[PDB]
């Protein structure tokens with residue numbers, strides 16, 4: 001995982017009655033916190049712009065310079 | 073024509089350049105700006121090999137295999153040390169400004185830049201400064217534009233303008249701020265604009281229709297069919 | 300030395316310069332041996348004879364590369380089916396530290412016009428273009444006035460001197476890029492395109508401007524031509540006892556007493572120029588370095604001040620003669636700051652075509668900025684040396700990046716202590732990610 | 742929005758007469774429009790492309806390649822100070838500091854009244870008389886930081 005999303009946690013009580021019930025969907029997996037990695041955010045690294053992070057606001061990124069700028 | 077690559081002797085066509093001759097022989101030379109249909113221009117400087125004047129030459133000289141004819145009795149080396157370091161350095165120079173985008177990039181697993189980065193053996197980053205960024209353009213319903221991932225290999229403009237005859241794509245700007253796209257937002261007018269998603273070796277131009285329901289290339293089930 | 304006796308035999312390019320620095324127009328130019336070489340060339344010599352005379356005179360290119368002009372002119376095709384040949388005058392002069400063509404075009408435009416006329420008759424070129432930079436307003440005005448005067452006098456246009464040779468001269472003003480001075484990029488910018496250079500072969504002599512045979516020559520080379528054709532080949536060989544024939548505009552700039560430009564024979568000592576002509580360094584300043592031929596040349600020290608200003612003599616010293624307009628660096632100048640300024644110029648004047656220049660000059664700029672701020676890290680100087688090794692000739696698409704890495708190479712070679720003093724913090728480009736133990740390499 | 746004037750079109754066609762290929766007049770067409778209007782807007786790119794018979798992408802690539810063709814609005818007077826190596830030796834940084842103190846702008850910006858725009862530029866070919874400045878068409882040499890306010894108030 002390049003985002004530390006999927007994690008294996010110290011829990012072993014997972015027995016079931018039917019085998020179809022061992023198919024865990026997204027609502028059965030998505031916990032409310034960061035798990036074992038408390039601070040990492042992939043979208044703070046990626047250059048792809050999302051809400052709250054426009055171009056140039058990721059880590060180690062300069063602001064975009066338009067080709068129409070007067071500076072050489 | 074007779075060429076000698078890394079001590080081995082090969083019979084090639086003299087009308088071909090060294091890159092296409094060596095690729096036809098199964099040898100692996102990294103390359104970006106050359107395309108079999110578009111010709112050679114010598115932009116990306118990735119296809120460097122070491123050419124010797126004769127058999128009894130030990131110094132040699134770094135040349136671009138796409139810009140060098142595969143003439144008779146041509147002595148070159150691909151696995152030469154200095155050529156390998158230069159190709160790795162070209163990959164590193166491309167990697168200095170490249171965004172940390174592979175998980176959220178539609179080219180991932182189908183990306184020529186990823187393959188050539190792995191092929192040159194470059195995996196360690198020592199560049200510590202900022203990366204240049206670019207604003208994207210709206211290119212219509214078919215092609216999605218992500219200008220951050222560009223390596224300035226000029227394949228898109230050469231295909232679109234010289235090959236396909238299109239008029240609304242071009243290269244703008246200057247030194248390290250080169251921008252490949254349209255002069256303004258709008259749909260790409262060419263009837264053959266969709267080939268940019270395979271012409272572009274990075275994830276700048278991607279299939280937007282595929283991007284709506286994206287999956288990786290290894291997860292695909294393919295068949296040979298007729299349009 | 301200030302008392303300079305400028306004779307036409309010893310100073311063929313500057314002997315008719317006026318004392319008030321005013322331009323010499325057509326009547327004053329023709330009053331002093333004006334268009335005599337053009338008349339002799341167009342009325343008594345074959346174009347092949349003129350090309351052979353220029354080749355035998357040993358005239359080399361003054362634009363920086365030093366290639367011989369006669370061999371460049373001999374590369375043109377011989378067939379009559381190609382007769383749309385072009386002559387281009389590289390009046391760009393955008394290399395920092397170069398100010399000679401400005402003087403030549405501002406005060407002696409008719410010398411340039413006569414040289415273009417002779418070279419166009421020799422090259423059988425029906426059209427000439429002066430690719431001039433846009434910052435030279437007075438040079439453009441004077442060149443256009445001189446072209447109008449020569450067209451009025453019958454020296455330009457249709458049936459020049461009754462020979463039957465047709466030649467028109469245009470002035471194409473530039474739009475402000477240093478890469479336009481490169482000859483193939485000059486051809487590209489003349490065609491109204493982005494000024495990317497072209498791969499050679501083919502050379503412009505076979506397919507240049509608009510696919511036609513084309514010869515690009517510096518202003519000073521074309522200004523050297525009419526003296527050769529008016530005074531003779533043996534006169535041109537018998538003015539300097541050096542391997543480079545003829546005179547050359549040489550100067551010294553910087554914090555010297557008398558910065559300027561003087562026409563001197565080849566083989567003149569750089570120390571001779573700096574002391575006699577430039578007057579030495581200013582008061583309280585000690586000489587520490589010099590660049591022989593502009594911003595794209597290697598730095599040399601005070602021990603190299605005694606070698607003659609020739610192509611080969613500076614070639615073995617580890618530098619290039621270049622434009623032969625040297626620049627002096629005194630002890631008050633930080634070499635890291637100077638090389639930083641040079642590399643910012645070279646990185647922002649890249650045309651963007653090829654990877655090593657475009658993506659490796661900004662890396663060197665950022666490293667030099669870090670060394671300037673005292674924020675250098677280990678491996679920075681090794682990265683700079685790797686950049687100089689991997690941006691040499693053949694590695695990049697044109698010669699802009701080798702000229703870019705020459706001063707960085709020479710400054711690291713000589714003044715390494717300042718670059719080592721720039722490094723003050725340990726190497727790091729990884730943040731600490733909580734929950735992940737790092738791979739502590741050794 | 743944009744429309745080329747009669748003088749602009751006539752000058753562009755007269756420059757088109759001087760070349761084998763009409764594409765070769767693109768730089769001077771952009772410079773003509775810049776001289777008339779201060780800079781080159783986007784409609785100027787399209788109009789020059791229509792007059793010259795070349796695509797607008799080529800005109801825009803030319804306009805954004807060359808630094809002296811302005812694709813952004815500038816002030817009434819363009820100060821262009823040399824930041825190259827000989828003027829760095831001769832002390833251009835004092836001149837730049839004096840200009841920034843007098844105009845209260847960064848290099849690459851325009852003053853609030855639209856009177857001055859400050860730009861670094863490459864070597865002006867006047868290195869023996871450095872440091873050098875280039876206001877709209879006038880080259881000023883032998884600059885000192887004390888003479889900057891005197892030099893700036895003669896350009897209204």
Ligand SMILES: Cc1cc2nc3c(=O)[nH]c(=O)nc-3n(C[C@H](O)[C@H](O)[C@H](O)COP(=O)(O)O)c2cc1C
Nearest residue numbers: 360361362389391392393480481482516517698699
């Ligand atoms: C980056 C670069 C910039 C150059 N700039 C100029 C220039 O401004 N003026 C010039 O005469 N030559 C310049 N040259 C040299 C030309 O390529 C060419 O050698 C010259 O213009 C004509 O050759 P000549 O010296 O035989 O006359 C430059 C070369 C390079 C690589």
Ligand code: SF4
Nearest residue numbers: 173174177180183275
């Ligand atoms: S273009 Fe290739 S290397 Fe770049 S982010 Fe996309 S997959 Fe990764």
Ligand code: SF4
Nearest residue numbers: 222223225226228272
């Ligand atoms: S957009 Fe793609 S094809 Fe065009 S220059 Fe950039 S990497 Fe090459």
Ligand code: SF4
Nearest residue numbers: 650651652653656697
């Ligand atoms: S070295 Fe390469 S990118 Fe740099 S100016 Fe020359 S061709 Fe352009």
Ligand code: FES
Nearest residue numbers: 105116117119138
């Ligand atoms: S593939 Fe040869 S330089 Fe790009």
Ligand code: FES
Nearest residue numbers: 823828864865868
């Ligand atoms: S370095 Fe400033 S005018 Fe040349």
